[PDB]
Short mmCIF file of all heavy atoms in Angstrom, two decimals:
data_model
loop_
_atom_site.label_atom_id
_atom_site.label_comp_id
_atom_site.label_asym_id
_atom_site.label_seq_id
_atom_site.Cartn_x
_atom_site.Cartn_y
_atom_site.Cartn_z
N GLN X 539 76.01 152.59 111.79
CA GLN X 539 76.37 151.54 112.67
C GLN X 539 77.68 150.85 112.24
O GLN X 539 78.30 150.24 113.13
CB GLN X 539 75.25 150.47 112.76
CG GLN X 539 73.98 150.90 113.53
CD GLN X 539 72.92 149.90 113.60
OE1 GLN X 539 73.04 148.89 112.89
NE2 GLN X 539 71.96 150.11 114.46
N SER X 540 78.05 150.98 111.07
CA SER X 540 79.34 150.29 110.52
C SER X 540 80.56 151.13 110.92
O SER X 540 81.53 150.57 111.30
CB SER X 540 79.25 150.00 109.10
OG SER X 540 79.20 151.26 108.33
N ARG X 541 80.53 152.46 110.82
CA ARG X 541 81.71 153.30 110.95
C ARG X 541 82.07 153.45 112.37
O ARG X 541 81.27 153.32 113.35
CB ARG X 541 81.40 154.72 110.31
CG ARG X 541 80.13 155.38 110.70
CD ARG X 541 80.35 156.42 111.85
NE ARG X 541 79.25 157.27 112.04
CZ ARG X 541 78.89 157.79 113.19
NH1 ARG X 541 79.63 157.48 114.25
NH2 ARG X 541 77.83 158.60 113.26
N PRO X 542 83.33 153.64 112.72
CA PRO X 542 83.76 153.80 114.08
C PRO X 542 83.31 155.03 114.70
O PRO X 542 83.00 156.07 114.09
CB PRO X 542 85.36 153.77 113.95
CG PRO X 542 85.58 154.20 112.55
CD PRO X 542 84.49 153.59 111.73
N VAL X 543 83.27 155.03 116.10
CA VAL X 543 82.66 156.05 116.88
C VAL X 543 83.72 156.77 117.67
O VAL X 543 83.45 157.23 118.78
CB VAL X 543 81.46 155.65 117.70
CG1 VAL X 543 80.25 155.36 116.87
CG2 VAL X 543 81.88 154.32 118.42
N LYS X 544 84.95 156.78 117.21
CA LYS X 544 86.07 157.27 118.02
C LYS X 544 86.00 158.83 118.08
O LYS X 544 86.63 159.36 118.97
CB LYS X 544 87.34 156.80 117.37
CG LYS X 544 88.54 156.86 118.36
CD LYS X 544 89.85 156.64 117.69
CE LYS X 544 90.94 156.70 118.72
NZ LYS X 544 90.92 157.92 119.48
N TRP X 545 85.34 159.53 117.23
CA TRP X 545 85.19 160.95 117.16
C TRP X 545 84.39 161.55 118.38
O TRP X 545 84.48 162.76 118.66
CB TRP X 545 84.52 161.49 115.89
CG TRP X 545 83.14 161.06 115.76
CD1 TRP X 545 82.64 159.88 115.16
CD2 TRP X 545 81.95 161.81 116.15
NE1 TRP X 545 81.39 159.85 115.18
CE2 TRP X 545 80.87 160.98 115.71
CE3 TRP X 545 81.79 163.07 116.74
CZ2 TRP X 545 79.61 161.49 116.01
CZ3 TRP X 545 80.51 163.48 116.99
CH2 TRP X 545 79.35 162.67 116.60
N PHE X 546 83.65 160.72 119.08
CA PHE X 546 82.73 161.18 120.14
C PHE X 546 83.50 161.58 121.40
O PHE X 546 83.08 162.48 122.08
CB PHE X 546 81.76 160.11 120.53
CG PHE X 546 80.50 160.58 121.03
CD1 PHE X 546 79.67 161.35 120.30
CD2 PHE X 546 80.17 160.21 122.41
CE1 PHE X 546 78.40 161.85 120.92
CE2 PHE X 546 78.95 160.74 122.91
CZ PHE X 546 78.05 161.54 122.18
N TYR X 547 84.76 161.01 121.59
CA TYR X 547 85.58 161.36 122.75
C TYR X 547 86.37 162.65 122.45
O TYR X 547 86.63 163.41 123.29
CB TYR X 547 86.47 160.29 123.12
CG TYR X 547 85.76 158.90 123.15
CD1 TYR X 547 86.12 157.92 122.22
CD2 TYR X 547 84.93 158.59 124.24
CE1 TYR X 547 85.48 156.73 122.23
CE2 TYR X 547 84.29 157.32 124.26
CZ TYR X 547 84.60 156.41 123.30
OH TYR X 547 84.07 155.15 123.28
N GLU X 548 86.75 162.93 121.19
CA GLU X 548 87.46 164.08 120.83
C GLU X 548 86.61 165.04 120.07
O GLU X 548 87.02 165.71 119.12
CB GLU X 548 88.80 163.74 119.91
CG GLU X 548 89.81 162.92 120.70
CD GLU X 548 89.68 161.44 120.53
OE1 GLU X 548 88.54 160.94 120.67
OE2 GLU X 548 90.72 160.75 120.21
N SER X 549 85.41 165.22 120.53
CA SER X 549 84.44 166.15 119.91
C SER X 549 84.80 167.60 120.13
O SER X 549 84.88 168.44 119.16
CB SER X 549 82.98 165.80 120.31
OG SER X 549 82.98 165.95 121.72
N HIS X 550 85.14 167.93 121.36
CA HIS X 550 85.53 169.34 121.69
C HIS X 550 87.00 169.50 121.81
O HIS X 550 87.43 170.49 122.39
CB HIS X 550 84.81 169.74 123.00
CG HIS X 550 83.35 169.67 122.94
ND1 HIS X 550 82.51 170.74 122.54
CD2 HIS X 550 82.47 168.69 123.21
CE1 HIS X 550 81.23 170.43 122.60
NE2 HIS X 550 81.22 169.19 122.98
N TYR X 551 87.80 168.60 121.22
CA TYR X 551 89.24 168.68 121.33
C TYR X 551 89.81 168.97 119.95
O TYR X 551 89.21 169.75 119.17
CB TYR X 551 89.82 167.41 121.82
CG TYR X 551 89.51 167.09 123.25
CD1 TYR X 551 88.39 166.28 123.60
CD2 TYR X 551 90.33 167.47 124.31
CE1 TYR X 551 88.04 166.02 124.96
CE2 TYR X 551 90.01 167.19 125.67
CZ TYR X 551 88.82 166.47 125.93
OH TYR X 551 88.55 166.20 127.18
#
Side-chain angles (χ1 to χ4, degrees):
Chain X
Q539 287 184 350
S540 64
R541 51 99 167 146
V543 286
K544 206 193 176 307
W545 65 273
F546 205 65
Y547 315 107
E548 294 96 313
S549 55
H550 300 271
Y551 294 90

